[PDB]
Amino acid sequence: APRQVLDLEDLVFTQGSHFMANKRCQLPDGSFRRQRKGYEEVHVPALKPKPFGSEEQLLPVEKLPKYAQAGFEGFKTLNRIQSKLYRAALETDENLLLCAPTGAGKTNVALMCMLREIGKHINMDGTINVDDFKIIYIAPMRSLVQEMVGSFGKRLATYGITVAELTGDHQLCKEEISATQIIVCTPEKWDIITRKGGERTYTQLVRLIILDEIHLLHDDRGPVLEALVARAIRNIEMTQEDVRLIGLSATLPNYEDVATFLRVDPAKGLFYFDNSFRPVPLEQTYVGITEKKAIKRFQIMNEIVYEKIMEHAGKNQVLVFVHSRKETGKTARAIRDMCLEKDTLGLFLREGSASTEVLRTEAEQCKNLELKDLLPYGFAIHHAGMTRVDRTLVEDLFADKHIQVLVSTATLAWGVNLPAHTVIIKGTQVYSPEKGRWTELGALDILQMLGRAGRPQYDTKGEGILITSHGELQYYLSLLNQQLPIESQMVSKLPDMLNAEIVLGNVQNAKDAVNWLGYAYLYIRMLRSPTLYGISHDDLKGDPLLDQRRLDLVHTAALMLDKNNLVKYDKKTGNFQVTELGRIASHYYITNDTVQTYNQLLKPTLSEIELFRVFSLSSEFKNITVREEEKLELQKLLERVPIPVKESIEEPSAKINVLLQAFISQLKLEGFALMADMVYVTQSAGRLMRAIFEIVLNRGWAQLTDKTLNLCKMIDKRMWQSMCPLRQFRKLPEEVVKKIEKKNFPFERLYDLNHNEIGELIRMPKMGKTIHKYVHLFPKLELSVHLQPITRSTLKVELTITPDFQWDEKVHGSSEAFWILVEDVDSEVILHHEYFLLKAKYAQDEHLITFFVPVFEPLPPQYFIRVVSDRWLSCETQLPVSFRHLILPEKYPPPTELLDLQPLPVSALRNSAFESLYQDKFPFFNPIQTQVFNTVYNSDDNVFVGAPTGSGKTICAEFAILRMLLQSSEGRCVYITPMEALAEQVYMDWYEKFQDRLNKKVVLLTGETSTDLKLLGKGNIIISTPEKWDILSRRWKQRKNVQNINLFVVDEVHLIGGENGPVLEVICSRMRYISSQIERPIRIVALSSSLSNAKDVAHWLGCSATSTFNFHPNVRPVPLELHIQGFNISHTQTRLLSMAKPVYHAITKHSPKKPVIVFVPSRKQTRLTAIDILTTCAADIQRQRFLHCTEKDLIPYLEKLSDSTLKETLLNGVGYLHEGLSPMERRLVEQLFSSGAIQVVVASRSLCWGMNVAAHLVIIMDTQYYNGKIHAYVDYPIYDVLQMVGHANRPLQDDEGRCVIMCQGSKKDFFKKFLYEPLPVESHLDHCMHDHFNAEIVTKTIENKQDAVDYLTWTFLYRRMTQNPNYYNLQGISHRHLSDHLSELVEQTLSDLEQSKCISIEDEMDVAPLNLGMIAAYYYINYTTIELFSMSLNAKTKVRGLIEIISNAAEYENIPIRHHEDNLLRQLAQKVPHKLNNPKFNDPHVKTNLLLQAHLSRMQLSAELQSDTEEILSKAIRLIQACVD
Amino acid sequence: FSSKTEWRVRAISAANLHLRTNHIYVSSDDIKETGYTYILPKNVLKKFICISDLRAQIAGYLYGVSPPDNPQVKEIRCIVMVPQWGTHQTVHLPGQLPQHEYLKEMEPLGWIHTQPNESPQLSPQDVTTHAKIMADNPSWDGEKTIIITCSFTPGSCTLTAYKLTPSGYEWGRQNTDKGNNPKGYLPSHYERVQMLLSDRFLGFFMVPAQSSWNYNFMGVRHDPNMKYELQLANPKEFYHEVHRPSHFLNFALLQEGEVYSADREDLYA
């Protein structure tokens, strides 16, 4: 029902984890209250372990699992709780919730729960090896993270599985985090990594989520913990797959609430054990001070300290906890003043002088810090600050039984297990920079420092002193007991959590928002106690479901995210729309209030002073203020920076700016409040800068994003840009760097000297070579790039980024990251950016990125592309592009407008005897035929036709074919397409349309010489392909049966502008001159797509212009509903990870009840995509809606298969396609997708070409693909995109056809632009020359340079190179420039031909073919490959040379290499017949000789490689015969 | 220059330098119309205005050509900024010229700098600095090379343009006294050249390879003849961190300064 807005601020309980929602506490057994002078003490007796039950026996590490007995070095028998839990903890995936107090080793229970997953992955001669499973252990503290990292590394090394802290950058530590097994981290940290996308690969490889200190749900950051809990449970349920939750929580109530939250079985899965399981019986003096008086409180507390240390001054160890660093040693030496104003009475904690190691006490005297002044006496401290190994030597000193009294900080208690005979928390008051003011210290620290008052070994009956506030006193007793529920903190967090859930896709509608609440501990909390959670029993009983409370709460967060514009969520339906600002807030864990404020303030050219200003505008520290006393040094900080804070007055923002700039110049402060302030602002500066610059680069402010990136670099590397990047190599001397900068020896001219003249700069010649090491290790790159225009609005620019320095995995690591930016006239308008990374293997190696850059209607001088290291500051390199000599192409005039033609019926052609196969399919003609009939059928001249794929040029060329047949019975049409399987699609259609009806032989030739010689000229219609019609008819003059052909159809013509075009285009021009010779022209049917330069095709074909009817793709039989979906996730791993659910969304949104063609980038991956679609439409709980018919009638297609995935996928009606699948499988799959019982086909990238079965909505996913030559990905061709999209064709019934494509952020612009805009075709015969040159030279058509240039004079280059001079490499527009280019052309072609010694170049005039080129052209082989033959092969070789040479031809050099295929070929040639020397398995020739030998011995391989093998034999025999020749 | 507080009041003004650029007025006045007419792409004026400073004289060399079949228009498609140190009313640069790949097919059109303050005539320092650049480099021809001065007007950016006359070449070639009113300075040296804005084209900027353009912080790191390479990249803002080293490298802080306040929460990651 309609939503009602709320006020949710006061509905939080501030002071979380110190709230103590329980108002009354329960005393322990022997507890009482003692009254002193203004301060009270609670005397609390200690707890007793449970009474020993009969046959209740702990476990030894022997009578636990025999396998997991590894790593158990250092333990003899299992501790009571671990032995009470181990059986269930290991024997099944039953999830665990442990309830106990500190001192048991809950780490040891989680360790058994993890040995469960260990024993889940095993083998005999193979190990626990971590290529199977991953798990995660999460605790909220990074001190404990380092501790458990050191511990988990050593302990779980004995299984060989590496565990590490998940502390790396998302892309910097992803390759190395893929090699690691189960890891350790924090709740918020793991949440950040997953919401960023680092977990997108580790998920579904994850079995065990262990959570230590799980009671932290009551904490401040609890929203991350609980949101992640919800994520785990919901996605596990949404997938129907499980993940185990093994949590260990302090003894407290709400155990069953959290058990329903963890979905663990409290039946046999949970546990209960109160504080009596704590090792050392903890007797507690919880004494508070009740007065307000502050100057007197700073004495009264010291007095309680004095008396408590008088209590310990005997045989004991007193460990004091305080909330600062210098207090460790300031309360110390005050105990010195105490025992020394006691007149050395109460001092001398020993028996006497030489007693108690006074010799060691004096012998270890001089130390790092001011510890010495006390350490001569019996007082000491602890903290991380003093030195590096100082806290080590203090903790081990106390463990060596000599430190009777130590005072220290919360980190020293969080750290290593340094226990105490008695501990005392003093004051319990912390100054929170997160709260900006006084806060009762956290409860996890309470438990942590309270488990060190008394030890398992060193102390028996723990004495625990808490000197505190007599307000929070009773709460401190409820904390000494297990009285508190584990409350959730949702209310303050809600809006960012909900926005982020929608930003990743876990809430599509406010429906799914209520679904987010229905799985959270918050709604579960209120399901226990809405009376506690602000919803009365009256409303809660009138609305049981709490879906009312979910509608109230969730809707308010939605409205707030709307008000800040980080969401776009219409109130009507419940659904939402996300933005880049919201994405930055989610990805950096930022709030959308100050995020939207910054978005509103930051303008285009807002200065760097403005950037640090809107940074001080971070309302995460909205409680930042001015310190009254510290306002004196605040101005000092306002004086020492170059970029002044003067824009304001001494105030909160002034504090932000000045503290930040000081701590950025690495300033220290005397005041501790100010120190923590700077610390906090600079530590949140990470997220501030990251989100700011993220939205900036997503927007396109060029110099502004540069300035913000510089600010982020200064925040990251803790230093500014005018201070050398040299300070990023830390083993390097400050004085060295300073002398290099004194005389600024530029960062440019530093390798201009050698390590003699390098050290000549600052005259330090014992350090010059190390300096050069640092220089050459700082990643530094060069690059080269080529720009050639497509049209005045498009210029394609390919950049190879090379490194001019060397990398080391101790400096650059496993990867290098640097952003390159293509920018316009004033470095303010940003064209497009690429975030390029040098891999581990790819260091020093050229990386190629190409881009088509804008310049529509332009006469401007140039553009830039700056490539600067992301991580490294002041590390860059510029890529200019100057357009002095850049000229435009010719702009295309508008296309021939689609006239108004009344629909033509099949009664147009009066030959019903021919229309017999036409009247049956379609009643009416499409606009293309209705316009082009009067040019094609009732006309006999050549014709050029542009129309989009899916329009029907089939009937256009059929009109001409039937016309020529009616002219003469046997008169022949040579139809040729650029694709073999698509020409076979033409075969299987046209042969059945014509020969069974018209009796005329219609066939499709093949590569075989004699076969074609007998077949061709015998039939009426002959189907051919590019090489098919090149190799043959290269013998044209004596080729009689090709000479008597009536007409020629070039179908799919604009293929010329792509690869494998020059072959067909050469056939076109050659056959043209042949028709000129034949004295009877052969009508030329050019049938292709929407063409910009269709006029050039028309000129190359010689057809009339008032008959040449060219249309744009906008005139297509069915229009395209066009949708494009970007990707700002660079790595295809997380990209394809989150490409699944939005695919289903756009499917159901475009056309829910229609067929779906899911073009997937792999034959391997379409199963993955359709399966994930099934498991997510399982979330869309309506299963098998893509199945429209019954299970039992579909069975006879299931009885004829093997593959086990198709069973389920097609029984649910989605299904996928592949190459190795059965031929009858492909046929039956087309059958099911056509009949529409399985209204979906998930199809490989390679399948759309010869695909005659269309779909309803076409969606392309991952428009790139992976090739092993660059060992990387490359984007799809324009005709290929058009094909995979237009293979949605539904003209008979549907009113539209739909094309949606998910592309990368890089390719978004060119993809959107050239989807519907017109595509040209240009010259590549100038690129590939020697083929036709050698062949026609032997065939005696190319007999002189004059005839060569004459063939160049009827070519396609002749038009294209002059029409578009940027790609022609000639800057000239005239006939003299055409002369220079043509001279260069024939000269260099026959030049290389005579250079390889393949032909005869006589007197410098004549050109004739000799033996080498003769055999090459004959065998239809490469002239380069033939020179490789001639100059590798000799008389000495056996098949040992034959195999190497035969695979070393270019005839197979287009062959591919697949994902991690280099292990395959190497581990195959391991035992294959013939090996190689230092070979590559990324090598085409090594791979091809390997497959040749493999097949010659006939070993068992995969069909994926046997297809390659058969293809290799298809071009092997010809090469081998030419080799014998 | 105070370098400490006039430093930051000037920089916090320099924080706003991008509001300037979208308010322009041009010197509309008498044209002799047989001298060249210069084409300004608004982008380079965007960058010029933004990266400058509110006192320090900052300048650059112009690069561009004449179009085919109509020389009388000289379109400037390149603004180069050089190492330097400027005054508040005169900018001093190295003598030696920019030359580079994209610099091949263009000639130097002259040079363009900023001006805090206004007057409707050319500085004697302007005429003489250019006449002494032309005293050495005949690549600068008399009927080809200009000076454009960009006054920062209240709510506007104004750009006055001049070319030198041969008599101005004469007095500048002579000039020894560069004072604010040298003897023999008069109208008789300068002449205003035709300039206009045009939205048809985007050009590029230029910056030294081993430096940035702004040494105004480093008047000792500058020289009369000191040589330089070039590259294609953006100038850094006048008050950029990079040429702002000693204010940011003024570091006298110690390790023990963290030993206090030794509570070490991260609570995140």
Secondary structure string (H, E, C) spanning A118-186:
HHHCCCCCCCCCCCCCEEEEECCCHHHHHHHHHHHHHHCCCCCCCCCECCCCCCCCCCCCCCCCCEEEC
- Chain B partners within 8 Å of A328 (Cβ): 262
Chain position carrying tokens 């005709």: A1279
Give SS3 for A851: strand
Report the gap between the CA of A955 and the closest CA in chain B (Å).
Answer: 46
SS3 for A1123-1158 is EEECCCCCCHHHHHHCCCHHHHHHHHHHCCCCCEEE
DSSP symbol at A214:
G
Cβ-Cβ pairs closer than 8 A, A with B, add up to 293
Instruction: Using the Cα atoms of residue A751, residue A755, residue A756 and residue A760 in order, give the sign of their dihedral.
Output: positive
- What Å distances lie between residue A1239 and A1230, A1277, A1284, A1288, A1433, CA to CA? 10, 28, 17, 13, 56
Helices A1165-1177/A1141-1150 angle, 10° precision: 70
- Take residue A1405 and report the two structure tokens written for it: 């005039």
**CA gap A499, A619 in Å, rounded:** 18
Q: How far apart are CA A1352 and CA A1342, in angstroms?
A: 11
**Documented resolution in Å:** 4.2
Rounded Cα distance, A1315 and A311, in Å: 84
Cβ-defined contact of B65 to A604 (cutoff 8 Å): no
| Stretch (H or E) spanning A1047 | strand A1047-1051
* Among A143, A184, A607, the residue to mutate for chain B (most B Cβ within 10 A): A607
Q: Are the Cβ atoms of A676 and B267 closer than 8 angstroms?
A: no
How far, in Å, CA of A853 to CA of A866, rounded?
15
HSE, side-chain direction, 13 A CA sphere, residue A365: 7
Give SS3 for B141.
Answer: coil
Give the mutation candidate from B38, B206, B249 for the A interface (greatest A CB count, under 10 A). Answer: B249
Residues of B in contact with A888 (CB under 8 A): none
Which residues of A are less than 8 Å from B234 in CB distance? 703, 706, 823, 827, 864, 866
Burial of A1435 (0-12, 13-18, 19+ CB in 10 A): exposed
The torsion defined by the Cα of A162, A165, A168 and A173, in degrees rounded to 10, comes to: 10
The C-alpha atoms of residue B35 and residue A1144 are separated, in whole angstroms, by 67
Quickly tell me which residue has 């294959």 as its tokens.
Answer: A1472
Query: How many of the other CB atoms lie within 10 Å of CB of A763?
Result: 8
* Least Cα separation, residue B180 to chain A (angstroms): 31
Closest-CA distance of chain B to residue A188, Å: 5
Helix (H, G, I), strand (E, B) or coil at A1051: strand
Closest CA to A1205 of A1179, A1183, A1185, A1225: A1225
Which of A442, A500, A21 lies closest to A224 in space, CA to CA?
A500
> What is the C-alpha to C-alpha distance for residues A977 and A1028, in angstroms, rounded to an integer?
10
d(CA A311, CA A332) in angstroms, rounded, equals 16
> Chain B closest CA to A770's CA: distance in Å?
22
Q: At which residue do the structure tokens 């876990």 appear?
A: A506
DSSP class of residue A1302? E
d(CA A859, CA A854): 12
Rounded Cα–Cα distance for residues A1113 and A1430 (Å): 49
Neighbours of A577 (CB within 10 A): 11
- Pairwise CB contact (< 8 Å): A862 & B232: yes
Contact A1141, A1316 (CB under 8 A): no
- Measured between CA atoms, the residue of chain A closest to residue B243 is A722
CA A731 to mean position of chain CA atoms: 33
A864 with B233: Cβ contact below 8 A: yes
Residue whose C-alpha is closest to residue A1165's, from A1261, A1288, A1299: A1261
How far apart CA A68 and CA B190 sit, in angstroms, is: 93
> Which pair of structure tokens corresponds to residue A89?
């903890």
Instruction: State the Cα–Cα distance between residues A1293 and A1232, nearest whole angstrom.
Output: 19
* Contact partners, residue A651, CB within 8 Å, separation at least 6: A626
**DSSP symbol at A895:** P
In terms of C-beta density within 10 A (0-12 exposed, 13-18 middle, 19 or more buried), how is residue A668 classed?
middle
CB contact under 8 A, A607 and B14: yes
The rounded distance, in Å, linking the Cα atoms of A1002 and A1010 is 18
Binding-site annotation, residues of A: 100-107, 947-954
Residue carrying structure tokens 């001019």: A804
**Can you tell me the distance from the alpha carbon of A224 to that of A192, in angstroms, rounded to the nearest whole number?**
9
Sort out which chain A residues have CB atoms less than 8 A from B245's CB and list them: 720, 722-723, 741
| Local structure of A1437: helix, strand or coil | coil
Q: How many CB atoms lie within 10 A of CB A1436?
A: 7
Torsion of CA A1132, A1137, A1142, A1145, to 10 degrees: 140
- For an interface test with A, give the residue of B232, B243, B253 to mutate (most A CBs within 10 A): B232
C-alpha distances (whole Å) from A864 to each of A658, A695, A1185, B70 are 35, 22, 52, 28
d(CA B52, CA B58): 6
CB contact under 8 A, B241 and A720: yes
Q: Are B14 and B55 in contact (CB under 8 A)?
A: no
Residue B69 and residue A340: Cα distance in Å, rounded?
A: 100
How far is the C-alpha of A219 from the C-alpha of A443, rounded, in Å?
8
Residue type, A416: V
CA angle A1297, A1301, A1303 (to 5 degrees): 165
C-alpha span between A627 and A634 (Å, rounded): 9
Asked if A1209 and A1124 count as a contact pair (C-beta separation under 8 A), the reply is no
CB contact under 8 A, B202 and A714: no
Closest residue in A to B222 (Cα–Cα): A744
**Neighbour tally for A315: CB within 10 Å:** 11
Neighbours of B22 (CB within 10 A): 13
The dihedrals phi and psi of B153, each to the nearest 5 degrees, come to -95, 155
Question: Among positive and negative, which fits the CA dihedral A933, A935, A938, A939?
Answer: negative
The DSSP element (H or E) to which A1071 belongs, if any, is helix A1062-1078
Identity (one letter) of the amino acid at A1443?
Answer: I
Check A722 against B266: CB less than 8 A apart.
Answer: no
Q: Which two tokens stand for residue A546?
A: 């709490």
Q: How far is CA A1446 from the centre of its chain?
A: 41
Residue type, B198: S
Instruction: Report the structure determination method.
Output: cryo-EM
Q: Return d(Cα A1015, Cα A1012) in angstroms, integer.
A: 5
Classify A742 as helix, strand or coil: helix
Closest CA to B228 of B23, B9, B107, B61: B61
CA-closest candidate to residue A1015, choices A1056, A974, A1067: A974
CA angle B81/B85/B91 to nearest 5° reads 75
Q: Do A862 and B204 touch (CB under 8 A)?
A: yes
Q: What are the angstrom distances between the C-alpha of A1429 and each of A1396, A1410, A1513?
A: 11, 16, 18
Token pair in block for residue A1330: 């020697």
| Burial label, A894 (beta-carbon count in 10 A; 0-12, 13-18, 19+) | exposed
* Eight-class DSSP state of A1057: G
Q: Inspect the interface and report whether the beta carbons of A141 and B267 lie closer than 8 Å.
A: yes
Instruction: Give A1105's strand partners.
Output: none
Exposure of A1199 in the CB half-sphere (CA atoms within 13 A): 6
Per-residue DSSP letter, A1317: S
CA angle B269, A517, A257 (to 5 degrees): 80
In terms of C-beta density within 10 A (0-12 exposed, 13-18 middle, 19 or more buried), how is residue A489 classed?
buried
Core vs surface per residue A812-847: b (16+ CB within 10 A) or e: bbbbbbbbbbbbbbbbbbbbbbbbbbbeeebbeeeb
Q: What is the CA radius of gyration of chain A?
A: 39
Which ranges of A468-607 would DSSP assign to H, the alpha helix? 473-480, 490-504, 510-517, 521-528, 537-542, 547-563, 580-588, 592-601
- Whether residue B239 and residue A863 make contact (CB cut-off 8 A), yes or no, is no
* Separation between Cα atoms, residue A927 and residue A952, nearest integer Å: 10
Cβ of A410 within 8 Å of Cβ of B267? The answer is no
Largest CA distance in chain B: 77
Assign A1428 to helix, strand or coil.
helix
Least CB-CB distance to B232: which of A672, A746, A878?
A: A878
Rounded to a whole number, what is the distance in Å from the CA of A1227 to chain B's nearest CA? 53
Residue to substitute from B66, B202, B211, B212, interface A, most A β-carbons within 10 A: B202
Separation of alpha carbons A1390 and B250, rounded Å: 68
